[PDB]
Amino acid sequence: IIPVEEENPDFWNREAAEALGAAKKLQPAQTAAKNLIIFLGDGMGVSTVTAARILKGQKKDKLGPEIPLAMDRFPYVALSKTYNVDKHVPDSGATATAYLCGVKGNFQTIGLSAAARFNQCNTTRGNEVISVMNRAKKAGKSVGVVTTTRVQHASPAGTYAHTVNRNWYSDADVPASARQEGCQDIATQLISNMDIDVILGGGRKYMFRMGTPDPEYPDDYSQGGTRLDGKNLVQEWLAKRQGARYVWNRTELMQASLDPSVTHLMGLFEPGDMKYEIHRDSTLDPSLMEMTEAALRLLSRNPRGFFLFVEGGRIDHGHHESRAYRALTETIMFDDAIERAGQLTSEEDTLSLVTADHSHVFSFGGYPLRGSSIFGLAPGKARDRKAYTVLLYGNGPGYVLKDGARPDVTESESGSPEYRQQSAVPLDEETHAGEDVAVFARGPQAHLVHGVQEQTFIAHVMAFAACLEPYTACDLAPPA
Amino acid sequence: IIPVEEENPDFWNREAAEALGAAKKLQPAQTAAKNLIIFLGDGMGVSTVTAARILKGQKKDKLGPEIPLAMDRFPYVALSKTYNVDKHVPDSGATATAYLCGVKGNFQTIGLSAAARFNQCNTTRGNEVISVMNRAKKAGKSVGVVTTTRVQHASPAGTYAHTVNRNWYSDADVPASARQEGCQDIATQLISNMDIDVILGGGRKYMFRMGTPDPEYPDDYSQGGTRLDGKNLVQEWLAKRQGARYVWNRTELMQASLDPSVTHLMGLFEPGDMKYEIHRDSTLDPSLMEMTEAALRLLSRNPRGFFLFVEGGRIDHGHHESRAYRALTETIMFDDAIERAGQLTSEEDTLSLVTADHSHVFSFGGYPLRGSSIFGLAPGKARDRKAYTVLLYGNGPGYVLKDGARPDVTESESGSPEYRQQSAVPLDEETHAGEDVAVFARGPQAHLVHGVQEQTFIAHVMAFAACLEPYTACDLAPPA
Numbered sequence: 001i002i003p004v005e006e007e008n009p010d011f012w013n014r015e016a017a018e019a020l021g022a023a024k025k026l027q028p029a030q031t032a033a034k035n036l037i038i039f040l041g042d043g044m045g046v047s048t049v050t051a052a053r054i055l056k057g058q059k060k061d062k063l064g065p066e067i068p069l070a071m072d073r074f075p076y077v078a079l080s081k082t083y084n085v086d087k088h089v090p091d092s093g094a095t096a097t098a099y100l101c102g103v104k105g106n107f108q109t110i111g112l113s114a115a116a117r118f119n120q121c122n123t124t125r126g127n128e129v130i131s132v133m134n135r136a137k138k139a140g141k142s143v144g145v146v147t148t149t150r151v152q153h154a155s156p157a158g159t160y161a162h163t164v165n166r167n168w169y170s171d172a173d174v175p176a177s178a179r180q181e182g183c184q185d186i187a188t189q190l191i192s193n194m195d196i197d198v199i200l201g202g203g204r205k206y207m208f209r210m211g212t213p214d215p216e217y218p219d220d221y222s223q224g225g226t227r228l229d230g231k232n233l234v235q236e237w238l239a240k241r242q243g244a245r246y247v248w249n250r251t252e253l254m255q256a257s258l259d260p261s262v263t264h265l266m267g268l269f270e271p272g273d274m275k276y277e278i279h280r281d282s283t284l285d286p287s288l289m290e291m292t293e294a295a296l297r298l299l300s301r302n303p304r305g306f307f308l309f310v311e312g313g314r315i316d317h318g319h320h321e322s323r324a325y326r327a328l329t330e331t332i333m334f335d336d337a338i339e340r341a342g343q344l345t346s347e348e349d350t351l352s353l354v355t356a357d358h359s360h361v362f363s364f365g366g367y368p369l370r371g372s373s374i375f376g377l378a379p380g381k382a383r384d385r386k387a388y389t390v391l392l393y394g395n396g397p398g399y400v401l402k403d404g405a406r407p408d409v410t411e412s413e414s415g416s417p418e419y420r421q422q423s424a425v426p427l428d429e430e431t432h433a434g435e436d437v438a439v440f441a442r443g444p445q446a447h448l449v450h451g452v453q454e455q456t457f458i459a460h461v462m463a464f465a466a467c468l469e470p471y472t473a474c475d476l477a478p479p480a
Numbered sequence: 481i482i483p484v485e486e487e488n489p490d491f492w493n494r495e496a497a498e499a500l501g502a503a504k505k506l507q508p509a510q511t512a513a514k515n516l517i518i519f520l521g522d523g524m525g526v527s528t529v530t531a532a533r534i535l536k537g538q539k540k541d542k543l544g545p546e547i548p549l550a551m552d553r554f555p556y557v558a559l560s561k562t563y564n565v566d567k568h569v570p571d572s573g574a575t576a577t578a579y580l581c582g583v584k585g586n587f588q589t590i591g592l593s594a595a596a597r598f599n600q601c602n603t604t605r606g607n608e609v610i611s612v613m614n615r616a617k618k619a620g621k622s623v624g625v626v627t628t629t630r631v632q633h634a635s636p637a638g639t640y641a642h643t644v645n646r647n648w649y650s651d652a653d654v655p656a657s658a659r660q661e662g663c664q665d666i667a668t669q670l671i672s673n674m675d676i677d678v679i680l681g682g683g684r685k686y687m688f689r690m691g692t693p694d695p696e697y698p699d700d701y702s703q704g705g706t707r708l709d710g711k712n713l714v715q716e717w718l719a720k721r722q723g724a725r726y727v728w729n730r731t732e733l734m735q736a737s738l739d740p741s742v743t744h745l746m747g748l749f750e751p752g753d754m755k756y757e758i759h760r761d762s763t764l765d766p767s768l769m770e771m772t773e774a775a776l777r778l779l780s781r782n783p784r785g786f787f788l789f790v791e792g793g794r795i796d797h798g799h800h801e802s803r804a805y806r807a808l809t810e811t812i813m814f815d816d817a818i819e820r821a822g823q824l825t826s827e828e829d830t831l832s833l834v835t836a837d838h839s840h841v842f843s844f845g846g847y848p849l850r851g852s853s854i855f856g857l858a859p860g861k862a863r864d865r866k867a868y869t870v871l872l873y874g875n876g877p878g879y880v881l882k883d884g885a886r887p888d889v890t891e892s893e894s895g896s897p898e899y900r901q902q903s904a905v906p907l908d909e910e911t912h913a914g915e916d917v918a919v920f921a922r923g924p925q926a927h928l929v930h931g932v933q934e935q936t937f938i939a940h941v942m943a944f945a946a947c948l949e950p951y952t953a954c955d956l957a958p959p960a
């Protein structure tokens with residue numbers, strides 16, 4: 001559909017004139033950031049962002065691509081180079097080390113330099129690299145970890161842990177030799193490595209001993225505690241903090257977030273990862289947006305400021321399933337959380353960065369008409385005279401041969417929330433992609449986010465902006 | 481391979497400290513641009529840029545992803561939204577209208593507002609939108625069009641033409657009704673619409689009448705002239721310009737580019753598009769880099785400055801064939817041309833933008849090791865126990881079923897210049913992609929290139945920077 005208003009060149013000339021005016025008004029801050037927020041869209045590459053924008057635009061009353069995402073409104077953009085030291089196409093652990101600790105590492109390790117080796121406990125020590133969140137805490141700021149995955153998953157773990165193996169969620173996962181050598185599981189590291197004021201997401205199970213019924217699924221044993229060392233880490237965490245509260249559901253989160261004197265809040269809302277937003281029980285579970293507001297309620301009380309990590313952690317998972325519907329709906333909720341944080345904080349004193357850890361082999365093609373669904377079919381048949389989707393994957397589990405050929409697909413099918421887009425190569429899981437991802441930035445020192453940078457730049461600019469870390473001699477005036 | 485130096489966190493800390501220093505030194509110009517250069521990588525999306533960087537890095541003596549492209553060194557980056565008014569995934573014609581005329585248009589039209597309709601000659605008039613190159617010429621600047629495609633192809637045509645149909649290369653292509661209605665073929669528009677000082681690329685055939693032997697392929701009739709109206713457009717062009725010279729080979733280009741008193745230069749080096757760089761006859765044909773130097777030699781003589789359009793036009797073509805080897809080698813040559821222009825011009829007075837018209841359904845995945853060839857196989861077999869490549873396409877002509885299944889592939893095969901990477905969907909041509917592309921910018925007013933913008937922004941910032949177009953009342957000091 002051709003929007004009549006866009007047929008007039010003045011429509012475009014007006015918009016661009018407005019764009020130039022706004023571009024010209026941009027000025028660098030001379031003041032430091034009181035607060036730091038990194039929003040991490042896990043797997044949210046450039047193709048995911050554009051596709052998400054179109055979907056969200058249509059979710060509203062619009063044609064799609066012309067409607068900005070909240071992240072699109074951020075003034076400063078850079079491209080981030082995501083390679084790990086040992087692999088061109090990275091994982092979440094070693095990219096976390098880069099954008100949270102400012103040092104690149106090897107695939108599947110977290111918070112360690114590339115002198116460490118994956119799954120070799122005895123290469124750990126000396127190679128720990130401290131996150132900017134850790135450094136923010138050392139400087140007196142409150143710190144928060146918020147994600148739709150397990151809080152012990154690779155991305156949030158980058159804020160606090162150091163491990164040669166991202167799979168070491170609880171002691172149950174650590175080989176005896178590594179346990180003997182003192183490599184702690186991530187759940188333990190979560191409560192021991194540093195003080196964290198707010199911890200919100202999934203991952204209940206790793207905190208409790210085997211036999212412990214999950215409170216929300218007391219009749220599904222696979223959801224119960226996993227630990228073999230007898231520890232209740234929630235209880236240990238509560239015991240070492242006054243003002244500490246633990247919640248596992250939305251209503252309790254709500255009460256806690258408004259309760260003055262709740263100073264430490266741990267909200268673990270599923271046994272493992274939180275449900276996709278489309279499957280979320282809105283009585284039992286907070287959305288990402290709700291969790292980030294809950295975090296902000298508590299974190300904003302500290303006069304010295306805060307560091308907050310907010311992850312759209314299941315964007316990635318949607319893409320791995322090659323279910324773009326799940327990837328993009330997670331991305332919209334991620335964008336809503338970004339929008340909400342923007343409503344609850346000031347860019348005068350808060351440096352906010354939105355980025356992705358890496359991308360996916362996700363593409364948006366065919367030649368679909370303006371206003372068409374992102375989940376629709378490309379106009380015109382493929383060379384095999386069957387339809388195909390505008391959304392596709394390079395590889396992954398949507399590769400199908402139905403009696404010896406690529407199957408036709410219909411609009412109703414292509415539009416289903418369970419639909420897996422086709423790929424060129426069958427894999428149980430679609431693969432990450434190695435191309436540059438965006439960094440969006442607003443707030444004090446956001447103008448420093450520019451050009452094409454190593455992913456490590458994200459950690460360093462945030463540390464610099466807040467006068468942390470090796471930049472205590474930033475030469476910045478106090479936050480506005 | 482793990483580079484030993486990168487195992488030390490100070491490697492990363494040093495680099496990022498250096499990055500912050502450079503970021504902090506960036507200052508906006510208060511002066512206008514004397515010169516304007518747009519480098520257009522046709523089809524050169526974010527995945528193409530990263531893949532190209534890795535290849536080029538290894539072409540040198542390096543592991544790949546850590547080595548900047550010339551374009552990577554540009555300080556300012558924005559994301560450009562490429563949708564056409566009528567289609568989410570655009571073509572080269574209507575994106576040209578956006579980044580060259582500052583107005584979005586409909587798919588397969590050039591230099592027309594979206595009030596025009598494709599292939600409807602009688603919707604043309606009133607809807608012409610004038611390019612910033614045209615406006616630069618009106619302001620006394622010299623102007624140059626340089627590309628590896630036909631100079632009448634959609635992208636260069638955006639600098640000078642206005643047509644409802646990009647396929648109208650010569651009069652031979654225009655229906656009688658449209659000819660009767662006065663819609664001129666692009667080759668005619670090339671010589672008639674405006675004065676152009678330098679025209680370098682392919683497209684000899686459309687300039688000469690049928691029967692005219694091509695000078696370089698006098699024994700292949702399909703390469704001869706196409707025109708039915710009896711016109712020799714080269715002769716007509718030469719006749720209306722003193723100092724005018726026409727060349728069809730590299731040695732003549734060389735002589736002309738150093739010949740003072742050659743004031744107008746038309747170099748048409750193939751009948752149609754120029755050969756891929758890997759197939760270029762270096763005695764007969766100039767590379768893109770060589771052509772852009774030739775252009776700069778002539779254009780730089782004007783004291784009022786110049787506008788130059790330089791296109792890596794066959795990046796796109798490589799991707800359409802799903803031959804990433806051709807796409808990426810074109811991208812490297814495009815980057816070399818950017819590097820060369822940077823050597824021959826000053827960022828004190830030259831605004832240079834590098835961008836793409838749109839992307840492709842090209843992805844870079846698997847989990848390949850550091851230092852591995854971009855054309856190599858992903859480590860580990862696919863779910864069908866056969867190898868797969870790190871480079872893949874969503875759709876296109878690399879979709880193969882060899883006796884009823886996805887064929888295995890070897891390293892020697894994957895690395896061949898003729899190799900087509902696999903896709904999910906068979907198409908004669910791989911399809912453009914609709915995700916945002918990068919804009920890289922350096923020079924006076926380059927800092928205005930920021931955030932997420934409509935593609936039209938590219939035209940407007942360039943016009944603004946040079947105080948052209950509707951921005952004669954820019955409020956800028958004279959060029960430095």
Ligand SMILES: *[C@@H]1O[C@H](CO)[C@@H](O)[C@H](O)[C@H]1NC(C)=O
Pocket residue numbers: 120122123
């Ligand atoms: C780590 O332990 C393994 C297993 O015994 C051993 O082979 C290796 O040498 C150790 N490396 C270090 C750094 O001690």
Ligand SMILES: *[C@@H]1O[C@H](CO)[C@@H](O)[C@H](O)[C@H]1NC(C)=O
Pocket residue numbers: 247248249251252283284
């Ligand atoms: C939420 O958690 C509390 C325990 O803290 C429990 O009493 C309440 O029943 C829970 N709500 C639901 C709906 O399960």
Ligand SMILES: *[C@@H]1O[C@H](CO)[C@@H](O)[C@H](O)[C@H]1NC(C)=O
Pocket residue numbers: 600602603
């Ligand atoms: C263009 O010409 C066609 C063919 O005769 C006609 O149907 C149509 O109405 C014309 N449109 C305009 C704008 O004159």
Ligand SMILES: *[C@@H]1O[C@H](CO)[C@@H](O)[C@H](O)[C@H]1NC(C)=O
Pocket residue numbers: 727728729731732763764
């Ligand atoms: C280049 O063009 C000129 C005509 O301008 C011709 O005399 C010369 O032979 C050409 N060179 C080659 C190698 O064909």
Ligand SMILES: [Ca+2]
Pocket residue numbers: 216248249269270284285
């Ligand atoms: Ca729950």
Ligand SMILES: [Ca+2]
Pocket residue numbers: 696728729749750764765
């Ligand atoms: Ca030639």
Ligand SMILES: [Mg+2]
Pocket residue numbers: 042092149153154155156311313316
């Ligand atoms: Mg994650």
Ligand SMILES: [Mg+2]
Pocket residue numbers: 522572629633634635636791793796
């Ligand atoms: Mg082109």
Ligand SMILES: [Zn+2]
Pocket residue numbers: 042043091092316357358
């Ligand atoms: Zn990830």
Ligand SMILES: [Zn+2]
Pocket residue numbers: 043092316317320432
């Ligand atoms: Zn992942």
Ligand SMILES: [Zn+2]
Pocket residue numbers: 522523571572796837838
């Ligand atoms: Zn194109």
Ligand SMILES: [Zn+2]
Pocket residue numbers: 523572796797800912
């Ligand atoms: Zn194309």
